[PDB]
Amino acid sequence: RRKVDYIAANHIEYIDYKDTELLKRFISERGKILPRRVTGTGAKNQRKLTIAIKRARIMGLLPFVS
Amino acid sequence: SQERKNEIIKEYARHEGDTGSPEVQIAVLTEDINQLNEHARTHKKDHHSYRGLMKKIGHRRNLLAYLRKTDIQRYRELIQRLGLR
């Protein structure tokens, strides 16, 4: 279905791993990253989100599990 | 690098507009090839980069063949400037 990206709608870019406020909504319980087909992001932005989230995880901003 | 390539064009070219020419291309490729040979001596395992090196080398050789066909004087002047065999 035609769905909208948060990022595109918000006109946000240069996704920093610090942005927990934006990254935490693309995460399901126990830290798993929501699929693109669930959320509705583009491939480029989705990959940037993956990298930012993994950075946040290693930097303690977000958990790997739980 | 862009600044080095600018310098090389301005040096070896017939005009400041003549960005494209065999002598210009070869002069750029020779510096690139020297950098890549040093990179290979430091990164002996990067065969994926050695491939692009060999491709650049073949490009240079074909340009030099075109020069030997068309203008032997231009060819010899070029090689005296560059240091190739």
């Binding site: 240069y14 791993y17 610090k18 950075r55 995880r57 290693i58 930097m59 303690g60 901003l61 977000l62 958990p63 790997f64 | -």
Partner: protein
């Protein structure tokens, strides 16, 4: 060309402001020794971590925005020294446009 480098690192939660400030100034001074110009140094937050990164479940984050060549060994020096130092928990570097 000089490339921009965001640098985060996690100060322990129970350090004193005196030694902490001298420590941030140490790392900035060492970046400047190796030739990497620091344009900004700022504490981000103090937070409850996601887990026990060095036993301390809590941390204090600092950010160091830097401009420097990629050939300069400033980042490698900061890296080795933060590894050796047992006060800061993590560091991390980010090449930025």
């Amino acid at each position: 060309q000089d490339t921009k480098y965001e640098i985060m690192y996690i100060i322990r939660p129970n350090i004193d402001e005196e030694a902490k400030t001298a420590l941030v100034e140490r790392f900035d001074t060492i970046l400047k020794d190796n030739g990497a110009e620091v344009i900004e140094s700022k504490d981000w937050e103090k937070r409850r971590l996601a887990y026990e990164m060095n036993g301390f479940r809590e941390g204090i984050y600092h950010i160091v925005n830097v401009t420097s060549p990629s050939t300069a060994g400033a980042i490698n020096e900061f890296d080795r020294l933060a590894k050796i130092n047992d006060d800061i928990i993590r560091h991390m570097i980010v090449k930025v446009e």
